[PDB]
Design a protein around this ligand. Structure first.
Ligand SMILES: [Ca+2]
Length: 240
């Protein structure tokens, strides 16, 4: 997250860190949202690589013991069947991870609330992106979980020529684009939390930013629109 502020450690208890094994250690690669005690929602592109993955719930500082983490292996990966790694702009950038164990819920570990199917946010709706992604374009991961206020940009604006044009689809949510605050590499897969009827819900799965840079004016961060995939999500969980 570029232009973030450090999150309070119990603000976003559905945020997870998706990590891969690298030598004698683990490396953060993406975010995700805990949606069942044994299921995480992330981006398809995050699991394109044949890697060994684990999820960390209850995480705040990637580099320090927080006293709240739970570590769990990824047992099954279900990518959306229409995802094409060649074509992030086509959409379908969503995947579900069944965890090897069920995690225990507490003020640091909670399920993310998903929107009702079909919900579209009005332009300029209040949302926060969260994650441990780069804090500058071509920078380094954050140590502590960051949040940034990113107001939505509706489809009509976001798919205009000055913004993303043809690249954005109605199966996506755009947020931000102010040139200061954005998602960045390592935020992919995590949530976009939007306040609706007094309740935050996870409306987006972080998908992509401009090839120019993370925080680019009129290139809002682009998210998979969770509310387009409610039936898909439920179908996967019920058949696994
Ligand atoms: Ca930690």
């Amino acid at each position: 997250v570029v232009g973030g502020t450090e999150a309070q450690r119990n603000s976003w208890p559905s945020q997870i860190s998706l990590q891969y094994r690298s030598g004698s250690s683990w490396a953060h690669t993406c975010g995700g949202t805990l949606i069942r005690q044994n299921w995480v929602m992330t981006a398809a592109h995050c699991v394109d690589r044949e890697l060994t993955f684990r999820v960390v719930v209850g995480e705040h500082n990637l580099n320090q013991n927080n006293g709240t983490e739970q570590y769990v292996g990824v047992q099954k990966i279900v990518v959306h069947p229409y995802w094409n790694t060649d074509d992030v702009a086509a959409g379908y950038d969503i995947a579900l991870l069944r965890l090897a164990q069920s995690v225990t819920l507490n003020s640091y570990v909670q399920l993310g609330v998903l929107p009702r199917a079909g919900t579209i946010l009005a332009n300029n709706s209040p949302c926060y992106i969260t994650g441990w992604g780069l804090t500058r374009t071509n920078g380094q991961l954050a140590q502590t979980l960051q949040q940034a206020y990113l107001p939505t940009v509706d489809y009509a604006i976001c798919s205009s020529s000055s913004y993303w044009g043809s690249t954005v689809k109605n199966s996506m949510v755009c947020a931000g684009g102010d040139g200061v605050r954005s998602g960045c590499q390592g935020d992919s897969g995590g949530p976009l939390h939007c306040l609706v009827n007094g309740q935050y819900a996870v409306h987006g799965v972080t998908s992509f930013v401009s090839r120019l840079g993370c925080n680019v004016t009129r290139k809002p961060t682009v998210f998979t629109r969770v509310s387009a995939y409610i039936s898909w999500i439920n179908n996967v969980i019920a058949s696994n």
